[PDB]
Amino acid sequence: MEAKAIARYVRISPRKVRLVVDLIRGKSLEEARNILRYTNKRGAYFVAKVLESAAANAVNNHDALEDRLYVKAAYVDEGPAVLPRARGRADIIKKRTSHITVILGEKHGK
Amino acid sequence: MEAKAIARYVRISPRKVRLVVDLIRGKSLEEARNILRYTNKRGAYFVAKVLESAAANAVNNHDALEDRLYVKAAYVDEGPAVLPRARGRADIIKKRTSHITVILGEKHGK
């Protein structure tokens, strides 16, 4: 009935990612892919990656049909702040992370 | 997907209920409540019921704070069909029922 995928600790600000997921909510899988390819917003690549994982889960788990898939939900949860360069005590700032969730469903199913 | 509630077999056409859930997606819990109270669309009552169930679960069981809750996702799936008559031959579907899902989460992100 439903397929989903989640990407955790993505190194992008939730505020930036939110801009991208709102573009694809409610769109067919085909339309969502097209939108993400032609937007130039930082974060598109990461959202496209989760979308492709959700589609694979739909096809592998429930043998759902990709041409019937659409984005029922897409949202972002705030992750912890993290210090890049792991541990090198230089002079770098802290960046926020995001957890991205995409849920796909198909028009007419079982 | 912090706190989720679902209402199944709602005897209202998915197309009609969708117009209601689109209004509250992404809003804070308090604003969604006011939106539903003032909206004069069929299905508002059933959406309100699912929202309140999700809110009760979030606050009572998940120890989440009502002031930080927002509608991360809200969507409608197509449910079983209703025939034109209860007995005798039928050659068309009258309408479809709907399943409504609402997922609440805390603050930041969208």
Domains defined for chain B, CATH in brackets = 1-110 (3.90.470.10)
Q: Mutual orientation of helices A44-61 and A29-38 as an angle, nearest 10°? A: 160
Q: Quick one: tokens of B4?
A: 């989720």
Q: Give the integer Cα–Cα distance in Å for B51 and B32.
A: 9
Quick check: B77 and A105 CB within 8 A? yes
Cβ partners under 8 Å of residue A70, min gap 6? A26, A27, A28, A29, A104, A105, A106, A107
Q: Give the integer Cα–Cα distance in Å for A20 and A41.
A: 7
Amino acid at A64: A
| Chain B residue at shortest CA distance from A23 | B110
Write down the residue that tokens 């959406």 correspond to.
B47
Q: Which residues of B touch A22 (CB under 8 A)?
A: 110
Q: Is the dihedral of CA B23, A34, B77, A103 positive or negative?
A: negative
Q: Give the integer Cα–Cα distance in Å for A95 and A108.
A: 42
Q: Which residues of A touch B25 (CB under 8 A)?
A: 25
Amino acid at A85: R
Rg of chain B over Cα atoms, rounded to whole angstroms, equals 16
Q: Residue B95's beta-bridge partner residues?
A: B82
Q: Quick one: tokens of A77?
A: 């949860």
Q: Quick one: tokens of B37?
A: 């109270």
Quick check: B109 and A98 CB within 8 A? yes
Largest CA distance in chain A: 55
Q: Quick one: tokens of A36?
A: 């993400």
Q: Which residues of A touch B78 (CB under 8 A)?
A: 108-109
> By three-state DSSP, how is residue B54 classified?
helix
Rg of chain A over Cα atoms, rounded to whole angstroms, equals 15
The CA–CA distances, whole Å, from A50 to A10, A12, A57 equal 11, 14, 10
Q: Residue A5's beta-bridge partner residues?
A: A102
HEC states along A31-86?
HHHHHHHHCCCCCHHHHHHHHHHHHHHHHHHCCCCCCCEEEEEEEEEECCCECCCC
Q: How far is B25 from chain A (nearest CA, A)?
A: 10
B-interface mutation test, from A18, A25, A77, A97, most B Cβ less than 10 A away: A77
Which residue in B77, B78, B105 is closest to A77 by CB distance? B105
Element (H, E) at B76: strand B69-82
The CA–CA distances, whole Å, from B64 to A72, B32, B33, B59, B61 equal 24, 17, 17, 5, 8
Asked if A82 contacts A95 with a C-beta cutoff of 8 angstroms, the reply is yes
Write down the residue that tokens 């990407």 correspond to.
A7
Q: Name the phi and psi angles at A100, rounded to 5.
A: -110, 130
Which residue in B73, B78, B107 is closest to A73 by CB distance? B73
Quick check: B75 and A75 CB within 8 A? no
**CB neighbourhood size of A25 (10 A):** 20
Asked if B75 contacts B103 with a C-beta cutoff of 8 angstroms, the reply is no
| Chain A residue at shortest CA distance from B71 | A75
